[PDB]
């Protein structure tokens, strides 16, 4: 029983009615949907580099949707009403950054830069200010403060530990929900946290192993995304 279906997941029920399976496809889609194709076995890797880093991540204290890895497509998670924003958190000038303010790719900043999108296909996920988000009372004062000290918090986490492996965290997107029927519920870390939603450099080479792999149509776009996984030790025997 699907629940949900986007671009690169399905959301299956379980007898569990808070509880629901994230289940990864091999679809992958670039520029609004100009672009698609199947690229099999993207979403097993996916999977397993998702579900590593969100136990990385809960290994900190970070609180996420993730319960259990189920098997290669699969893991069971919180069932949780998303908020509709996207987090893009950026390292270096990459994408539509750089293509907006005509700075050149791998740019470092002296500090990460966020940047929120409202998350609707449509519109093509317009960006949006912080009191747009306010306003329109997708979150508090205090979450969105909340929003921004988890998020780079999670790019320290992340940076370092691809950093040890000899990847440079370059941009990556979030996404956050609360539990359901809690006003109070705390930001839980949802969606996926893979080469899908990370751009992601080797350092010695600047090879890009992430998505811009297809986005940019350079070919092994498998072999970029088995290398994080490997690199990261995150599928399992
Ligand atoms: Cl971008
Ligand atoms: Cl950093």
């Not at 780079?152 to 359901?180: A, P, Q, T, Y």
Request: glycine share 4%; aromatic share 10%; hydrophobic share 40%.
């Amino acid at each position: 029983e699907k629940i949900y279906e986007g671009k690169a997941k399905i959301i299956f029920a379980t007898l569990n009615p808070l509880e629901v399976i994230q289940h990864f496809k091999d679809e992958i889609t670039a520029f609004n949907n100009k672009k698609a194709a199947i690229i099999h076995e993207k979403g097993i890797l996916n999977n397993y580099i998702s579900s590593f880093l969100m136990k990385k991540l809960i290994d900190k204290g970070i609180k996420t949707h993730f319960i259990s890895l189920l098997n290669q497509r699969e893991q069971l998670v919180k069932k949780i009403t998303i908020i509709p924003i996207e987090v893009v958190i950026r390292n270096l000038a990459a994408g539509n950054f750089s293509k907006r303010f005509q700075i050149a790719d791998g740019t470092p900043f002296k500090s990460p830069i966020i940047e929120f999108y409202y998350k609707n296909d449509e519109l093509s996920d317009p960006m949006v200010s912080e009191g747009h988000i306010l306003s329109f009372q997708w979150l508090t004062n205090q979450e969105l403060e909340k929003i921004k000290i988890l998020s780079l918090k999670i790019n320290n986490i992340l940076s370092e530990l691809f950093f040890n492996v000899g990847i440079k965290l370059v941009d990556f997107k979030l996404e956050f929900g609360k539990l359901h029927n809690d006003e109070q519920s705390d930001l839980f870390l949802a969606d996926e946290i893979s080469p899908d939603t990370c751009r992601l450099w080797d350092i010695s080479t600047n090879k890009r192993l992430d998505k811009d792999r297809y986005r940019l149509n350079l070919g092994n776009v498998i072999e970029g995304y088995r290398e994080v996984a490997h690199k990261l030790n995150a599928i399992p025997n």
